[PDB]
Enzyme design. Sequence first.
Site, PDB file in Angstrom:
ATOM      1  N   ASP E  54      55.372  43.926  35.692  1.00  0.00           N
ATOM      2  CA  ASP E  54      54.948  44.020  34.588  1.00  0.00           C
ATOM      3  C   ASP E  54      56.008  44.344  33.290  1.00  0.00           C
ATOM      4  O   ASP E  54      57.171  44.536  33.441  1.00  0.00           O
ATOM      5  CB  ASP E  54      54.344  45.525  34.656  1.00  0.00           C
ATOM      6  CG  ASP E  54      53.548  45.981  33.469  1.00  0.00           C
ATOM      7  OD1 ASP E  54      52.173  45.533  33.416  1.00  0.00           O
ATOM      8  OD2 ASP E  54      54.028  46.660  32.590  1.00  0.00           O
ATOM      9  N   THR E  87      51.034  41.818  28.332  1.00  0.00           N
ATOM     10  CA  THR E  87      52.056  42.066  27.702  1.00  0.00           C
ATOM     11  C   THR E  87      53.263  41.025  27.637  1.00  0.00           C
ATOM     12  O   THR E  87      53.802  40.911  26.762  1.00  0.00           O
ATOM     13  CB  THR E  87      52.705  43.389  28.643  1.00  0.00           C
ATOM     14  OG1 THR E  87      51.722  44.190  28.824  1.00  0.00           O
ATOM     15  CG2 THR E  87      54.038  44.183  27.847  1.00  0.00           C
ATOM     16  N   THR E  88      53.590  40.471  28.894  1.00  0.00           N
ATOM     17  CA  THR E  88      54.794  39.420  28.712  1.00  0.00           C
ATOM     18  C   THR E  88      54.318  38.251  27.661  1.00  0.00           C
ATOM     19  O   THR E  88      55.041  37.738  27.098  1.00  0.00           O
ATOM     20  CB  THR E  88      54.899  38.982  30.118  1.00  0.00           C
ATOM     21  OG1 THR E  88      55.111  40.036  30.993  1.00  0.00           O
ATOM     22  CG2 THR E  88      56.150  37.966  30.186  1.00  0.00           C
ATOM     23  N   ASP E 391      46.712  47.453  36.151  1.00  0.00           N
ATOM     24  CA  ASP E 391      46.456  46.170  35.562  1.00  0.00           C
ATOM     25  C   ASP E 391      45.230  45.566  35.793  1.00  0.00           C
ATOM     26  O   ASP E 391      44.322  45.325  34.825  1.00  0.00           O
ATOM     27  CB  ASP E 391      47.350  45.227  35.732  1.00  0.00           C
ATOM     28  CG  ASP E 391      48.708  45.510  34.685  1.00  0.00           C
ATOM     29  OD1 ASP E 391      48.892  46.383  34.169  1.00  0.00           O
ATOM     30  OD2 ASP E 391      49.475  44.260  34.492  1.00  0.00           O
TER      31      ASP E 391
HETATM   32  N1  LIG Z   1      45.128  30.777  38.976  1.00  0.00           N
HETATM   33  C1  LIG Z   1      45.637  30.574  38.069  1.00  0.00           C
HETATM   34  N2  LIG Z   1      45.887  29.425  37.710  1.00  0.00           N
HETATM   35  C2  LIG Z   1      46.661  29.030  36.538  1.00  0.00           C
HETATM   36  N3  LIG Z   1      47.186  30.097  35.396  1.00  0.00           N
HETATM   37  C3  LIG Z   1      47.085  31.280  35.684  1.00  0.00           C
HETATM   38  C4  LIG Z   1      46.186  31.870  37.033  1.00  0.00           C
HETATM   39  N4  LIG Z   1      46.226  33.204  37.063  1.00  0.00           N
HETATM   40  C5  LIG Z   1      46.804  33.514  35.749  1.00  0.00           C
HETATM   41  N5  LIG Z   1      47.292  32.353  35.336  1.00  0.00           N
HETATM   42  C6  LIG Z   1      47.978  32.349  33.989  1.00  0.00           C
HETATM   43  O1  LIG Z   1      49.204  33.258  34.151  1.00  0.00           O
HETATM   44  C7  LIG Z   1      49.376  34.112  32.838  1.00  0.00           C
HETATM   45  C8  LIG Z   1      50.042  35.451  33.783  1.00  0.00           C
HETATM   46  O2  LIG Z   1      49.899  36.373  32.824  1.00  0.00           O
HETATM   47  P1  LIG Z   1      50.652  37.864  33.058  1.00  0.00           P
HETATM   48  O3  LIG Z   1      52.264  37.550  33.012  1.00  0.00           O
HETATM   49  O4  LIG Z   1      50.194  38.360  34.500  1.00  0.00           O
HETATM   50  O5  LIG Z   1      50.403  38.647  32.097  1.00  0.00           O
HETATM   51  P2  LIG Z   1      51.102  40.023  31.571  1.00  0.00           P
HETATM   52  O6  LIG Z   1      51.866  39.458  30.335  1.00  0.00           O
HETATM   53  O7  LIG Z   1      50.195  41.159  31.145  1.00  0.00           O
HETATM   54  O8  LIG Z   1      52.095  40.255  32.838  1.00  0.00           O
HETATM   55  C9  LIG Z   1      48.068  34.195  32.276  1.00  0.00           C
HETATM   56  O9  LIG Z   1      48.513  34.261  30.946  1.00  0.00           O
HETATM   57  C10 LIG Z   1      47.257  33.180  32.910  1.00  0.00           C
HETATM   58  O10 LIG Z   1      46.811  32.325  31.873  1.00  0.00           O
HETATM   59 MG   LIG Z   2      49.248  39.828  33.279  1.00  0.00          MG
END
Ligand SMILES: Nc1ncnc2c1ncn2[C@@H]1O[C@H](COP(=O)(O)OP(=O)(O)O)[C@@H](O)[C@H]1O
Ligand SMILES: [Mg+2]
Lengths: 528, 155, 526, 98, 532, 100
Positions: E54, E87-88, E391
């Site tokens: 996170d 958030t990231t 989350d």
């Molecule tokens: N199955 C998938 N295939 C391709 N991209 C994905 C998949 N699942 C998530 N993503 C992308 O990866 C990113 C992960 O975001 P994440 O880092 O979990 O958000 P946060 O900032 O809340 O941690 C998301 O923006 C999403 O668009």
């Molecule tokens: Mg995320």
Amino acid sequence: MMPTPVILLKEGTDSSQGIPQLVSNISACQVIAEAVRTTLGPRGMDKLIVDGRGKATISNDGATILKLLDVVHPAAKTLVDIAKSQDAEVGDGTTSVTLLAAEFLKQVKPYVEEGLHPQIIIRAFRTATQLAVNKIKEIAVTVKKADKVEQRKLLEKCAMTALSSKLISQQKAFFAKMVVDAVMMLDDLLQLKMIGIKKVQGGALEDSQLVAGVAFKKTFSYAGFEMQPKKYHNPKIALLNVELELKAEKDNAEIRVHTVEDYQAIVDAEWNILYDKLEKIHHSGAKVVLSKLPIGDVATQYFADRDMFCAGRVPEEDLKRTMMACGGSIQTSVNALSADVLGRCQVFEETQIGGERYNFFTGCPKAKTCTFILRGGAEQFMEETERSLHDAIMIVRRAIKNDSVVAGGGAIEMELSKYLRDYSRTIPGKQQLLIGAYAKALEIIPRQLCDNAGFDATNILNKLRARHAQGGTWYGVDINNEDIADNFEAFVWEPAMVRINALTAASEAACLIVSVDETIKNPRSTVD
Amino acid sequence: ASMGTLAFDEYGRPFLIIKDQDRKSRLMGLEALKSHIMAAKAVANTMRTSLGPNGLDKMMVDKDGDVTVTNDGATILSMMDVDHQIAKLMVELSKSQDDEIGDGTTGVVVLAGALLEEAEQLLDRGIHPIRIADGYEQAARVAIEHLDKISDSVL
Amino acid sequence: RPVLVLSQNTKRESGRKVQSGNINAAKTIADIIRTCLGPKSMMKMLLDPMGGIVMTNDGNAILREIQVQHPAAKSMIEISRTQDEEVGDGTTSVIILAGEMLSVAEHFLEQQMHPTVVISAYRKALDDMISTLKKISIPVDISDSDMMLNIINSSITTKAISRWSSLACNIALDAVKMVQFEENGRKEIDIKKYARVEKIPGGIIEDSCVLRGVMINKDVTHPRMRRYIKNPRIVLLDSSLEYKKGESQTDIEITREEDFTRILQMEEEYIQQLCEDIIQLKPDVVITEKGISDLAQHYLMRANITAIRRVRKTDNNRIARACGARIVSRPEELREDDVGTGAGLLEIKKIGDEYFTFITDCKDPKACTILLRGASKEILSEVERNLQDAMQVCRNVLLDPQLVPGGGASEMAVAHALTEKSKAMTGVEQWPYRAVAQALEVIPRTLIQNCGASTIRLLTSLRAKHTQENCETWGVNGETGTLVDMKELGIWEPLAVKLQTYKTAVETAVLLLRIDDIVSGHKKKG
Amino acid sequence: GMNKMVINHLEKLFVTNDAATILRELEVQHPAAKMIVMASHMQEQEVGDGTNFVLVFAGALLELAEELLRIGLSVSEVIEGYEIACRKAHEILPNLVC
Amino acid sequence: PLSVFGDRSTGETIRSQNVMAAASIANIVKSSLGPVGLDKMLVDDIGDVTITNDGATILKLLEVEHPAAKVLCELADLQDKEVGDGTTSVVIIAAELLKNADELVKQKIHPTSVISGYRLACKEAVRYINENLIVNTDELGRDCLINAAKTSMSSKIIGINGDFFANMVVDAVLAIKYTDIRGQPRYPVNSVNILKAHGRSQMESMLISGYALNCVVGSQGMPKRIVNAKIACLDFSLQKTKMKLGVQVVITDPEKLDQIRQRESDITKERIQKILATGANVILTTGGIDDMCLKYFVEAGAMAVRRVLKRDLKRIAKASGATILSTLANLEGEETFEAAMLGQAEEVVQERICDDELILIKNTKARTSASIILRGANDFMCDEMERSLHDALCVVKRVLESKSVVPGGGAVEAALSIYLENYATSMGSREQLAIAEFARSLLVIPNTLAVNAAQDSTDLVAKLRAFHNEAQVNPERKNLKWIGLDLSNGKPRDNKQAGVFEPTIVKVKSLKFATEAAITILRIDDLIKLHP
Amino acid sequence: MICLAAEYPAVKFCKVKSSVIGASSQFTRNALPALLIYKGGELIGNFVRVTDQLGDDFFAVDLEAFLQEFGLLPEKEVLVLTSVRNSATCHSEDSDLEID
Ligand SMILES: Nc1ncnc2c1ncn2[C@@H]1O[C@H](COP(=O)(O)OP(=O)(O)O)[C@@H](O)[C@H]1O
Ligand SMILES: [Mg+2]
Ligand SMILES: Nc1ncnc2c1ncn2[C@@H]1O[C@H](COP(=O)(O)OP(=O)(O)O)[C@@H](O)[C@H]1O
Ligand SMILES: Nc1ncnc2c1ncn2[C@@H]1O[C@H](COP(=O)(O)OP(=O)(O)O)[C@@H](O)[C@H]1O
Ligand SMILES: [Mg+2]
Ligand SMILES: [Mg+2]
Ligand SMILES: [Mg+2]
Ligand SMILES: [Mg+2]
């Protein structure tokens, strides 16, 4: 990481690798570039650097500023090295090389951050640099007439363009004419040691003069020197490499006598040796005597009795310049002082310049040497004037070698950027992005000119891009008119080799910086 | 506004570019011009009270206690112990005026101080200092021509 | 002034160096106790920073006594603690398995395979291993005491108590059986609270026994009371039997001559009333978690009642379970049902130079104490740890009657099953699957290495044997370094222990494979 | 291959991708690494190229020897097998000339 | 001249310093984005270890000195508080916006023009997202919720086990649904009590159809299981009665002291008897219970739990239909306990979880509640599981509240970049450049996703941009708006059909917060740092 | 101190070398073993030469009793073994609310 009781490298070894260290290298190159950023163009500004001893060096030359900066970053030293290389090969453009290299690195930084393989970037730079050099060689303006008047005007314009960035830019026409005349008086090799640079405190810049001959400061006159005449109207100069003073015959020499008659004979023999040397010099018909080795008081009085001029301990390069100007030969022995080895000048005179006495050898008709006597209010003033004149002299020499010129004010680089963008728009697309980045990076110099001048760089750049696209090759930045103008018709000329070498060196530095991926720093030994 | 720059990189790795960059100072842009103008103004204002028949002497003491009561501006500035580089430039200007002429070593400093003082208010209104220097050069040429015009000869 | 984005003490390490360091730390933690597995394991001496000495070959104690700085080692130690708490056995096995899986993962990490692919392959392999382990299991009749004793023996052949195997097995089985409880439709064991282990240095180990009751280190308050009661009626209390200050501020004001004497006599009468309320039930023993006043002692003594005071709450609960009593905090509300009948003998005897109180003839007791006699304190501590392992294994078998062949047979069978299953993947993730499948061979390899026989020849022979059809029970005789069929040797382990070990090791590898950046030095900011 | 800026104990810049130069300009302290460095330098002296090959092959051989020692083989067996395989490779190599 | 006791930085120096600080913060967490992202593992220099992915947690644990880096840190915290996801992404977007805006400023573009361009770009991006990139969940069913949960849990330690964790999360969220006044069904997440305990594997995590308490019975004599529980929730300690500060006992006749002392406990005796006479089986109190009242409950064969947390007790009372009673006092001045104050449940047990015990209130009546017991390998893994689970719960709540979702995998960012690049030509002259730079900066998310997968980021993002340009140019090729990135294979893919979804509120709030932070930082052109 | 820290989590046992603090030469040479105690920002413990009243074989029981003689150790609290943990964060509760 684990302790690993016996570590591999010596303790204190620092290592950095991967994309982050390359981005750090690019940032360091940017930091180096911004130190000389404001020194570029007719609106450039000098920089003052103080060393540990407290001595200040005021300069506008990029190479000098970078040398005075104690750079220790391994990636950043490349910019200083290429600045030195540009100074050595050409002598002008020592700031343009740094700006171009740093702008290349900055433009390709985003693609490095995306994980692009650096070999692709290196290949793109090589291709773009080859194309740009070929385009420069194709579109450079040359005249197939070899007219002496046209050649002189071309050299003068190149010197003026080179000089219109320093504190002597107000008298740039005067200094350009002086430099062009001095260079044309060089014979065939354009040796820099054949051009004297004398710096005398006091007086205005317009008081600085070029001597069609040779001049040097008075050197530690002995007693009786003020009794010698200080002006001649057709003197014959006896250039000598001889110690004219009473002294031991040899270091290992030893005299053993057992009679007072032999004692007196030995004393008279020493005196007669000195007098024989002096009489051999005098009978040669010479009136001015110059010696690299000291000339004693006895010889000084002897010459004063004969209405002759003598000056010992003359610096060796000054003697060589005197030989070149007058046409004699430096003699280590006085046994054969024929008319062949005697120099000749029309007028010799000792005059005072700013609280110092200088010997003047004017009127030489076959002189292959010169002497710049520079005036100014401070030591750094003369030093910066000398640096600017050195830049102008190097430019004029290179133009003498080949009279191929391109317009300044960034016009050549805008044309190159347009050509490179047009080329890049016809390739698959992985190289197209990098070549377009190179072409955009080529726009740094006109933007820097506008920024230093206080313009709005964006509007001027848009106008320049439109003008180059719609037809027009030599349209650059008109600093005075706050606008753009045909810089070729404005006589803002620049030798082609300046831009050629700038592009080549910047590309080489950028490729070398991009290639490296790991930096290892072994610990300093014996810090003391 | 000083101590150069300090980054330490955006990746947290050490960022060393210039040797002893932590112990070096740096002035940039208009602040440097203002500081130099103020130092030169101080030097010129110190000199300006020793101008004319009603000028007053400066009692100069060296590092050994030797006392020199003098009015010669070049001598005063040569014996003065200064550290600012612009002050050293003023001293060298006085020395050059002394070497070339021998008189007027005080008028040059006052004139330079006045010129920089006017350049201060010219810069405050947004004029590139190169423009100020060019205008000063043009005015100096005009003044020199006028001096040549109104000059008078003696036997 | 050194202005920075992060604090000076913050240090950030990233890249493949972090993964290599984590895997190396896990490997080294495994190598700490690699030699302490199998029936031929060698014990270790641990010097407690508080001054004591811990002598054991149990993995959990050894790893707990070690202080480490690399946080991957902390993760491995927490893994050991979790495995110990969940099932009570397989600590060294799970540590070694985690180390081996992390090694075979570092293999692929050195190449250009992303850790997420390894994680997915590991999870698939974990599902397949759970399936195979359930498949090759066998049921057990818990009624047969011989099979239970054999299971406990197989659990304790690897410890120092193995020389007295029948005695330890019987002690553990009897304790676990008699602590088993069921009330309100809920079944429980609760080895932690009841089934106490009391160790008294001296004597001989063969004198150790499990009592049909509870023994405490307490003596009668007054010497005139009986120290030997045939069929006691025990009453337990929490409240003190002495006059105590009230909750609120209750200052008195005496203005008459006879109020002081009246106050003191009222205190005495209150004590007498409490003692009479206790006596009304006609008990023989009164146990109190708190003090008993001297006057209360007199009034109980006049009724021929033995009184013991200042007993820990856990000991009082154990006594209540053993003798079937209920603790009552108010004597005036004492009921007949609360009186503890069921204890068949109470006896205070002197062991060494210190008195001990025995309630050791209870009929159907739900709590017990285990009396350990040994050479010294450290020997008895190790014996108690071995007994804890035996009781945990017994309770695991009682909860789940499934058994799995031991001594490397289960690991080899599961490895062969997963290797055969991997033949039909044809994906980039089959290689980590196979690698983590054959990583289970580290247990037979460690058994052979500790035995002293040649690793390569024996392991190759075992793999060849397991490649046959009905050879899932072929393991390594850890004492002689020969291949045997464990349906003949008789080494068996509960399915719960193996399942927990495999799950914990695989998830340890998964957790430590997701890390590629380490930052440290920042304050707690609490 | 990627060039490496190596700064030795005298602050002399050494940017290169030549293995012999990099290893010479590195303050190697571990004695086994010292033996590998000496072998690479001997390769440089005898032939002039292939130092990186020497070092990479030595590292791979030592990694696989560690694996073999872990699985049960003794040091002498690994050494004998390595010598036999080296002889076999030297025999094979002339037939690979293109 | 200023004579200010401090340090001053002015012009490009302070701007570059702020940009460097923001870039450092972004680069700290850039490696933990997307399914190919990897976790970090912090140490709190006392031995404490925190393994997490996170972004908000990472930025909250770190100690930061630079003000702009702090600004990004509380931006991350605010994004977590208001949304719970992205958030990231929002941190990275804000830092990239700042970097590109600073480049524009270095190009002698006035910062106010850049700010105006950024505001216009943010407004137009939100409008375009709401008008072209939204997908309604009404026609999807439970599949959209499951896929949103799985997408949220990707890149977390529970990614592979999504097939099970998403079902558990959706069931837990749907268990706590309630419709308030005006008929808007609100989903009160943070009412799902998350309980952690190391032990069995991840798949053994239990979703309780009721409530879970991290407390046990106060006495070992009480039963450990009651079938038909009548829960009595109390908010006062059951101890010996003590007079207040304003009441003082002064005895002049000794005959009354025994009566006083007896009443001191008989008062609580009577209160306990009044509570128990109504048929209560389980008694939960926020205060403590002494040994006397514990025995009183023991004899009645009823539960008694002390030191129950106030929030847990409130949740239990709401779920079971009980009413919290801080005191026993009806409106007649007397002391009574009505039987209607008792909650009910189908069972109350004390199960054992890894050598420890906890109380489960199973299947409360009059309301359905939920709780999740997470089983991991150690404390660190359980903590990371809990963070990822929170989350996912927040993502499901956002999706169920506002029924609009957008495709994931960087499709939205690419579409926004293409649209804004095409749209910047129709507004101003320098805010045109600002909007173009905003569009270019929006592409950092797919670039980071591709880089984390060790794939060709340039080619993949070029293909994505070509697909989205074709979607925005050809009216009949509008199904290409969902073309996102497939990180496993490194090829573009229709994410809407694949099942990668995010709440629209995540993207909208992230854009708004990042734009506001970029504007806030971009205003600074001079810093004075006073000596402490 | 290690044994006592488990007994009293409230206390903040810590150790520091006399060299870094800047102790005097005499204090360094023959006054090193001392239990500095601070509460409320002011000194509460005035103990030096702890070996004089404790010897060199003192256990945690001895130190605990000696400190409790002067009433400086905070009183113990009843504690139980949590599973591992329950709480995650404290914010807007938003608990269950059954509404028509
Ligand atoms: N199955 C998938 N295939 C391709 N991209 C994905 C998949 N699942 C998530 N993503 C992308 O990866 C990113 C992960 O975001 P994440 O880092 O979990 O958000 P946060 O900032 O809340 O941690 C998301 O923006 C999403 O668009
Ligand atoms: Mg995320
Ligand atoms: N009169 C002028 N008008 C416009 N540009 C000029 C003029 N004179 C010089 N320049 C520009 O200045 C640049 C070089 O600046 P200068 O400081 O003299 O040398 P360097 O290249 O070492 O910085 C050239 O690119 C040239 O185009
Ligand atoms: N007599 C034996 N011969 C061969 N293997 C045995 C024997 N006794 C136990 N084992 C094996 O040794 C393992 C137990 O090792 P142990 O030292 O108890 O490790 P842990 O303490 O981690 O359980 C079990 O897998 C069991 O199958
Ligand atoms: Mg130049
Ligand atoms: Mg005068
Ligand atoms: Mg075991
Ligand atoms: Mg080679």
